Amino acid sequence: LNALASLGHKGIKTLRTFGRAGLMLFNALVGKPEFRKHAPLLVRQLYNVGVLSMLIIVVSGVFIGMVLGLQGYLVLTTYSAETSLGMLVALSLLRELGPVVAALLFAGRAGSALTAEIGLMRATEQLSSMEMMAVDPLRRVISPRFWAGVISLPLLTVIFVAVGIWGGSLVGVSWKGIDSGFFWSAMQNAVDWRMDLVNCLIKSVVFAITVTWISLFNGYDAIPTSAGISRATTRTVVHSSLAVLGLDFVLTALMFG
Amino acid sequence: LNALASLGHKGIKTLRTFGRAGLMLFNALVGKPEFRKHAPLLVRQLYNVGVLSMLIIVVSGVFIGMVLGLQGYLVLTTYSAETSLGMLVALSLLRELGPVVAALLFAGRAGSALTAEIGLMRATEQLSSMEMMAVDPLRRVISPRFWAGVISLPLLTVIFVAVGIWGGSLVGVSWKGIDSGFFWSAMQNAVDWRMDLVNCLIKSVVFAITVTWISLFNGYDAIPTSAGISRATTRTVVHSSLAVLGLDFVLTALMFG
Amino acid sequence: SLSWMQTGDTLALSGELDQDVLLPLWEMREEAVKGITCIDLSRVSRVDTGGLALLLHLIDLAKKQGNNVTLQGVNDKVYTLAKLYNLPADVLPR
Amino acid sequence: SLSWMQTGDTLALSGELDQDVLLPLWEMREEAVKGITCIDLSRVSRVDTGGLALLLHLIDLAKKQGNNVTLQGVNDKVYTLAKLYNLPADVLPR
Amino acid sequence: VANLVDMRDVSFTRGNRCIFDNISLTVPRGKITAIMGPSGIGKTTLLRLIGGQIAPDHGEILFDGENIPAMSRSRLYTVRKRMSMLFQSGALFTDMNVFDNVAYPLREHTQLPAPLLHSTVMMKLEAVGLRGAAKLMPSELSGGMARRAALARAIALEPDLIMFDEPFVGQDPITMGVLVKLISELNSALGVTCVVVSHDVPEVLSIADHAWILADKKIVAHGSAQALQANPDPRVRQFLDGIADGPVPFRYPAGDYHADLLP
Amino acid sequence: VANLVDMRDVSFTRGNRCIFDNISLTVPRGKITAIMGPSGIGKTTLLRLIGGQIAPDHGEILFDGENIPAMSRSRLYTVRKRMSMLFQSGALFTDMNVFDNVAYPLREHTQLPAPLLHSTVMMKLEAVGLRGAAKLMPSELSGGMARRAALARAIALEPDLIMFDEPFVGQDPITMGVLVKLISELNSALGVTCVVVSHDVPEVLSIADHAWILADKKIVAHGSAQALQANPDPRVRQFLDGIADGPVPFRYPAGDYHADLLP
Ligand SMILES: CCCCCCCC/C=C/CCCCCCCC(=O)O[C@H](COC(=O)CCCCCCCCCCCCCCC)COP(=O)(O)OC[C@@H](O)CO
Ligand SMILES: CCCCCCCC/C=C/CCCCCCCC(=O)O[C@H](COC(=O)CCCCCCCCCCCCCCC)COP(=O)(O)OC[C@@H](O)CO
Ligand SMILES: CCCCCCCC/C=C/CCCCCCCC(=O)O[C@H](COC(=O)CCCCCCCCCCCCCCC)COP(=O)(O)OC[C@@H](O)CO
Ligand SMILES: CCCCCCCC/C=C/CCCCCCCC(=O)O[C@H](COC(=O)CCCCCCCCCCCCCCC)COP(=O)(O)OC[C@@H](O)CO
Ligand SMILES: CCCCCCCC/C=C/CCCCCCCC(=O)O[C@H](COC(=O)CCCCCCCCCCCCCCC)COP(=O)(O)OC[C@@H](O)CO
Ligand SMILES: CCCCCCCC/C=C/CCCCCCCC(=O)O[C@H](COC(=O)CCCCCCCCCCCCCCC)COP(=O)(O)OC[C@@H](O)CO
Ligand SMILES: CCCCCCCC/C=C\CCCCCCCC(=O)O[C@H](COC(=O)CCCCCCCCCCCCCCC)COP(=O)(O)OC[C@@H](O)CO
Ligand SMILES: CCCCCCCC/C=C\CCCCCCCC(=O)O[C@H](COC(=O)CCCCCCCCCCCCCCC)COP(=O)(O)OC[C@@H](O)CO
Ligand SMILES: CCCCCCCC/C=C\CCCCCCCC(=O)O[C@H](COC(=O)CCCCCCCCCCCCCCC)COP(=O)(O)OC[C@@H](O)CO
Ligand SMILES: CCCCCCCC/C=C\CCCCCCCC(=O)O[C@H](COC(=O)CCCCCCCCCCCCCCC)COP(=O)(O)OC[C@@H](O)CO
C-alpha cells in the first residue's frame, strides 16, 4: 500500500532524529575537561538562563500560592479543619506544582530563548567560523549552556516553593485569621525531608535535563532561515510541555504510589 | 536626581505603549462589517490557531487528569471517602485547572506562532505593500486572527476538561476499583450549571481576549529584524503567563469567594 | 461610456475600453457577435488590459460560430500592448 | 630557535622571530637593553606580526632609558610589513 | 502639469538623526528618474514620503498638483491607486500562489468576471516572463524571480507611477539584464513614469533620463548621464568611480598611535 | 608544490540534486584565483569542500599535497590553522566587541602575553582601517564594515590561504573600492593565496590572475582576464556581458497560449 510505505518513511526519519540528538549531547559533554576556559562561559550563561528567569518565577509563585490558599480554605472550613491549611499548601507545592509549573514556565521563557539563540548562530555562520579556527563548537557553545540549565532550574524551583508558601500564609493567616501558631506547626510535622524535600529535587533535576536537551537540540537542528527558526522555537514549547507532564505522571506513581 | 529622571522616562514610554495597543485593537475591530470577505479569512486562521493546537491540549489533559486522580485517591482513602473522587476531579478542573493550564499552553503554542507570523510580515514588507494597494492591514490581517483566538480557546478548554475527566475516571474506576455507579452519580449532583459550567466559560473568554491581544500586539510592534522578532516571541510568553495567573486570582476571589 | 451598434456584419464600438465600463458588453455576449465578420473599433478613445481581454473573447466567439474575423480602425497603441503581452497572430489579426 | 647575544652596545639577534619562540626574549627584558644603542638583526630568517611587536617594545625600552636607537641588517621585508601596518617613523627608524 | 511628483523643500528626522535637510527634486511625466547615493543614507525613506506613508517635518510633496501630507485618509486611498511600489524583497504574500498574488489588487478594486480576470493575469504574467510559474508558491521562487512576479502585481491596476526600491541589489549579471529590459519596455509601452532608487551606477545610468545624487543630506548633484560623468566635484567623483579614499575617508576616526600600540 | 589547492575530479550531491559533476581546478600559490558563475549554482559549497567540511561523493581535494577528505580529525584541525575563510555575513560573534573578535584566534592557538597581544591586534585593525572602531559592538557596525573587521580576524594567525565568499554583494561602489584595495595589498605583502568566489564580474576581473567560470555543473571556461573577454562560447558571453536572452532563457518553461488565455 502507498500509505504503509509513507508511514514507515516517517518512522525511519524519526529514528535518526533521536540518533542525531544522542550524538549532539555525547560529543558536547565528553572529553578534555577545561575547567578554566569554561568557567567564565558558565557565568554568562547562568545570567541568561537563570537571572533573567527570576521575574516570571517569583511573580507566578506568589499568585499560585494565593489561589491555593483561597481555594483550599473554602474546602477545609466545612469540616472545621482550616488549621491544616499550611499542610495542604506546602504539600501540594512540594509535589506536583513546584516542579511542574516552574518547568512549564522555564520551557516557555528560557527554552524559547535558547532555541532562538543557537539557530541565529547558524544563520549568521558563527558556528561554521568557529570550526575554521579549529575550535569545537559543541564543547564551546553547547556545553556551557547545558550545565547552566541543569543548575538553574533546581534553583528556580526552590524559590518558587518558598514564595508560594509565603503567599499561601498571606491568605490563610493575614486575611482569613487562622492562628499562626497552629498554621506553622501543623506544616512542620507534616513535611518530611525524605518524602517531600528530596523528592522535589529529584523531579526538578529530571525536568531540567529534559527541557534543556530538547531546547538545545531544536536550535542546533533547525533550518537556518528566519521562518525555520520560528518554527523550531514553537517546537520546543510543545515537546517540552508534553515531556514534563508525561514524566510527571511516571514519577508520581513511583514516589507516592 | 539622575535616577528619578530615568524612572520617569520609562514611566512615560510605558504609557504610550499601552496607548499604541489600544489604538491597534480599536482600529481593527471597528467599521464596515465585511462579512463575506472575512469569512474565508476566518476559517484559515481558525486552522492555524485552533486545529494545530489540539495535540498539546488533548495529550496534556489526559496526563493532568490522571495525576489528579492518582493524587486525590491517596488523600481520600484515609477518610474512606474515595467514592467522592469524581467530585474532586471534576470540580478541580472546572475551576482553576481547565481555564488556567489550557491558557498557559495556548500562550506558548498559539501565542508564539502569532507573534512570529506578524513580525515576519513586517520584516518582508508585506504589511506596507498592502497599504499601497489601498487595503487596510488592520482590518484584513489583524482582525481575522483576533476572532480566531477568541473563538478557539473556549473550544479548546471544553475539550481539555472532557478528556481530563475521562483520565481521572481511568485511574479511579479502572485501576483502583471504585464502584462506577458511585463515581459518576456523586459527580452529577455536585456539578451545578451556574456555579461551575458557566464560570468555566467566563474565565476562558477573559483569558482568550487577553492572550490574543497581547500576542497580536507584540508582533505588530516588534522591531523587524531576525533578532527583534525572537525577542518579541519571548515577550509574549512572559506577559501572557503573568496576566493569566494574575487574572485567575481576581476571578477566583469573585466567583467562589 | 461604452456603447455598441450593429450594422449587419460590423460591430462598431465607441467610447473607452476601460475595465469598469465593460459589464454591459460582457453580459450581452452571443447576441452581439451573431453575424459579425468585422469589428470596426475606429471610435474608441483608449484601451487597457481589461478591455483588450474582452476583445480577445469577441474574436474567439465570432470565429467558433463563423468565419475568420477581421479588424480595422485600431489606434496603433493596441498594437504596442499586443507587442508587450506577446500575443500570437491567430488571436489578434494583423 | 631564537637566541640573542650582546657585544656591549649591539643586541645581535639570530634565528626566527615567530610568535611561539619569543617567550624567553620577552621575559628577559630590562636586562638585554641596558646599554644597547643598535640592534643588528642581520641574521634572522623571517619575521611576522608577533615578532614585529616585540621589536617595537625593545626600541621603546632602549629609548626611555637612553638614546635614540638605530638598526641595520633588516631583510627589506620587515619594511613591507611596516608599510602595510602603517607604522610611524618614530617607532621604527628609517 | 509637466511634473508628476514635486518635492518642494522637504525635511525629515528619525528620533534625533537628521535625514534630508532641505532637498528638492522633480519627477517628469513619462521619464525614468534615478536617485543614487551611498548605502546608509536612508534613501528608501524618500519613497515613503511620496507614497503617502510617514509625514515630513517641513515641506510639500505634490502628486500631480495635490499635497500628500495635507490630505485626508479617504483621499489618500484613492490617490494610492495611481501609484505602485516594488519593494526590495518582492513583498509577496506567503500563502496564495503566484496567480493569486497578481490577481489580488484586481479582485479588490475592479468588477471583472471570472473570465477576463484569468486572461488579464495571464497577460501580465507573460509580460514579465513567468506564465509557466503561475502555480508555484513564493517560497519556491528563487528571489531574482520574486521581483519579477512582484512587478506583474505592480502593473495590475495600470498605475501612473511605479517606485522601484533597489531593483538591482545582490543580483547576477543575467538577472540585472532582465530587469533593465523590463523597465525599458514598460516605459516605452504604457507610458509609465518610473522612479528608481539604487546604488548600482552602471546599470541605472543605462536607462535613466535624469539622475539625482544624494551624497550628504543635500541633493549635491543632478543632471543627465553624460552631464554627470563630466562633473568635477570631489564628492561626486568618488561615488561614480568607486575611489577608496576621498571626502568619505577610508580610515575610521581614531585616536593616535603610541597609546594603544605601546600602552 | 606549485599548486596549493588541487581538486582532481570532484562530485557532490545534495539529497537528489546534482551539483558539480566532474570539476577540476587548480589554485596556484601566491596568486588570486577567481571562481565565477550564476547565482543559484551553489558555489559556496565549493569553499566547504576545500575547508574540510562536508565530504564529496567522488574525488580528491589536495591541500599542499595532502588529501582533505581522507584525513583524521586531529590532522584536520592542525591543517585548518593554515587556511582561513571570510563569510558573506562577516560572521562576527554578537557579544565580544571588535577587539575581542580579532583577538579570539590569538587567544586560542598562541602563547603571547597581554602586551604584544594588544599591539598585534591594533596592527591588524589598522591594516583594514578600523582601529578607531575597536570598542564598538558588531551590532553597530554597518555591515560593509563588518566584512572589514572579519578580514582582520582572518589574517590573525598568518594563514597561507584565505577563501572569500562573495565579498562584493549588495555593496556600494565606494565600499567595493575599499575591498578591492585590501585584497590587492594583502597579496602583495604577506604572499597570501586568495580564492574569491563571486558573481560581480568587473570588480573581480580587475584583481584576479586566473578565473574559472562555472556555468552548468561543469567548469566550462577558464583563463586570464583578457583571454576570457575574447572567448566565443555562447554560455560564456551571456554571463560576462549580461544578455537577457541566450542559453539561459528569459521565459520560464510554460505551456501554450489559447488554453489559459482563452480557457
Ligand atoms: C466521635 C465523633 C467523631 C466525629 C469525627 C468527625 C470528623 C472526622 C474527619 C473530618 C475531616 C478531616 C479533615 C482532613 C484534613 C487533612 C487534609 C490534608 O491535609 O490533606 C493533605 C494534602 O496533601 C496532599 O497530598 C494533596 C497534595 C497534592 C495535591 C495535588 C496537586 C493539585 C494539582 C494536581 C497536579 C496537576 C498537574 C500540575 C498542574 C499543571 C494530605 O496530607 P497527609 O496528612 O495525608 O500526609 C501526607 C501523607 O500521609 C500522604 O497523604
Ligand atoms: C544525561 C546527562 C547527565 C548529566 C547529569 C546531571 C547531574 C545529575 C545529578 C546531579 C545531582 C542530583 C541531585 C539529587 C539529590 C538526591 C540524591 C539522594 O540522596 O536521593 C537518594 C536516592 O536517589 C535516587 O533514587 C536515584 C535518584 C537520583 C537521580 C536523580 C537524577 C536522575 C539522572 C541522574 C543521571 C546521572 C546519575 C549518575 C549515577 C551513576 C536517597 O538516598 P538518601 O541518602 O537520601 O536516604 C536513603 C534512605 O531512604 C534509606 O537509606
Ligand atoms: C528516573 C526516571 C527516568 C524515567 C525515564 C522515562 C523516559 C521518558 C521519555 C521521554 C521522551 C521525551 C522526548 C520528547 C518527545 C515529545 C513528544 C512529541 O514529540 O510530540 C508530538 C507527539 O506526541 C505524542 O505522540 C504523545 C507523545 C507522548 C509524550 C512523551 C511522554 C513521555 C513519557 C510519559 C509516558 C507515560 C505513560 C503512562 C502509561 C500509563 C509530536 O507531534 P508533532 O508532529 O505535532 O510535532 C510538532 C511538529 O512536528 C508540528 O509539525
Ligand atoms: C457519629 C460519628 C461521626 C464520625 C464521622 C467521621 C468522618 C466525618 C468526615 C470525614 C471526612 C470527609 C471527607 C470529605 C470528602 C469531600 C471532599 C471534596 O469533595 O472536596 C471538594 C473539592 O472541590 C474543590 O472545591 C477543590 C476544587 C478546586 C481545587 C483547587 C485546584 C488545585 C490547584 C490550585 C490551582 C493552582 C493554579 C493552577 C496551576 C497552574 C469540594 O466540593 P464541595 O462538596 O464542597 O461542593 C462545592 C462547594 O460546596 C464548595 O465547597
Ligand atoms: C475587547 C474586545 C471585546 C470582544 C468581545 C468578545 C466576545 C465577548 C463575549 C462573548 C460571549 C460570552 C460568553 C459568556 C457566557 C456567560 C453569559 C451568562 O449567562 O452569564 C451571566 C452573567 O455574566 C456576567 O457575569 C457578565 C459576565 C459575561 C462577560 C464575560 C466576558 C467579559 C468581556 C465581555 C466584553 C463584551 C461584553 C459586552 C456587553 C455590553 C449569568 O446570567 P444567567 O442568565 O446565566 O443566570 C443568572 C442567575 O444567576 C440569576 O438570574
Ligand atoms: C470581568 C473581569 C475583568 C477584570 C479586569 C482586570 C484588569 C487586569 C489587567 C491586566 C493587564 C495585563 C497587561 C500585561 C501586563 C503584564 C505584566 C508585564 O508586563 O510583565 C513584567 C512586569 O510584571 C510586574 O511588574 C508584576 C506585573 C503584574 C502582572 C499583571 C497582573 C494582572 C492583574 C492581577 C492583579 C492581582 C492583584 C491582587 C491584589 C490582592 C514586565 O517586566 P519586564 O521588563 O521584564 O518585561 C519583559 C521584557 O521587557 C524583558 O526586558
Ligand atoms: C535524566 C533522565 C531523563 C532524561 C529524559 C530524556 C528525554 C529527552 C531525550 C531526547 C529528546 C531530545 C530531542 C529528541 C528529538 C525531539 C523529538 C523528535 O523525535 O522530533 C520529532 C517528533 O516526532 C514524532 O512524531 C514524535 C514521535 C513519537 C515520540 C516518541 C514518544 C516517546 C518515546 C516512546 C516510544 C514510542 C514507540 C512506540 C510505542 C511502543 C521527529 O521529527 P520528524 O520526524 O517529524 O522530522 C520533521 C521535523 O519535525 C524535524 O525533522
Ligand atoms: C505581587 C508581586 C510580588 C513581588 C514581586 C517583586 C517584583 C519581582 C522581584 C524580583 C525579580 C526581579 C529580577 C531582577 C532582574 C535583574 C536583571 C536585569 O537587570 O535584567 C535587565 C532588566 O530586567 C528588567 O526587566 C528590569 C526588571 C524590572 C522588574 C519588575 C519591577 C516592576 C515594578 C513596577 C510594576 C508596577 C506594578 C504595580 C506595583 C505596585 C535586562 O536587560 P539585560 O540583562 O539583557 O542587559 C542589561 C541592560 O539591558 C539592563 O539595563
Ligand atoms: C475582557 C476583559 C479583560 C481584558 C484584559 C486586558 C489586559 C490586556 C490589555 C493590554 C495588553 C496589550 C499589550 C499592552 C503592552 C504590553 C505590556 C507593556 O506595557 O509592555 C512593556 C511592559 O512594561 C512594564 O514594565 C510592565 C510595567 C507594569 C505593567 C502594568 C501592570 C498592570 C496594570 C497595573 C497598573 C500599575 C500602576 C501602578 C500601580 C498603582 C512596556 O514596554 P517598555 O516600556 O519596557 O519598552 C521597551 C520594550 O519592551 C517595548 O517598548
Ligand atoms: C495518551 C494519549 C491519549 C490519546 C492521544 C491521541 C493523539 C492525539 C489525538 C488527536 C490530536 C491530533 C490533532 C490532529 C492534527 C491534524 C492537523 C494536521 O494535519 O497538521 C499537520 C500535521 O500535524 C501533525 O503533527 C501530524 C499529527 C500527528 C498526531 C500525533 C500521533 C502520534 C502517534 C504515534 C506516537 C507514538 C507514541 C506511542 C503511542 C503508542 C501539520 O501540517 P500543516 O497543517 O501545517 O500543513 C499540511 C501538511 O503539512 C500536512 O501533511
Numbering used by the authors:
A (entry chain A), B (entry chain D): 3 to 259
C (entry chain F), D (entry chain C): 4 to 97
E (entry chain E), F (entry chain B): 5 to 267
Paste lines from the article.
The structure of nucleotide-free MlaFEDB at 2.9 Å resolution shows the detailed interactions between individual protein components and bound phospholipids. The final map of the MlaFEDB complex at 2.9 Å resolution reveals all side-chain densities and most secondary structural elements. Clearly defined diacyl phospholipids were observed to bind in the cavities of the MlaFEDB complex, and are located in three distinct regions formed by MlaE and MlaD, namely the central, lower and outer cavities. Two phospholipid molecules bound inside of the TMDs are located in the central hydrophobic cavity, which is formed by the TM1, TM2, and TM5 of two MlaE subunits and the hexameric ring of MlaD. The positively charged Lys53 and Arg55 in MlaD, together with the Arg97 and Arg196 in MlaE, form close contacts with the head group of the bound phospholipids. Notably, one acyl chain extends toward the MlaD and the other acyl chain extends deep into the hydrophobic cavity in MlaE, likely representing an intermediate state of the phospholipid being transported. Three phospholipids were resolved in the lower cavity formed by the TM1′, TM2′, TM3′, TM4, TM5 and EH of MlaE and three MlaD TMs. Another two phospholipid molecules were observed in the outer cavity on the surface of MlaE. The nearby TMs form a V-shaped open groove (middle), which may represent a gateway for phospholipid entry and/or exit. The observation of phospholipids in the nucleotide-free structure also suggests that the phospholipids can enter the inner cavity independent of ATP.
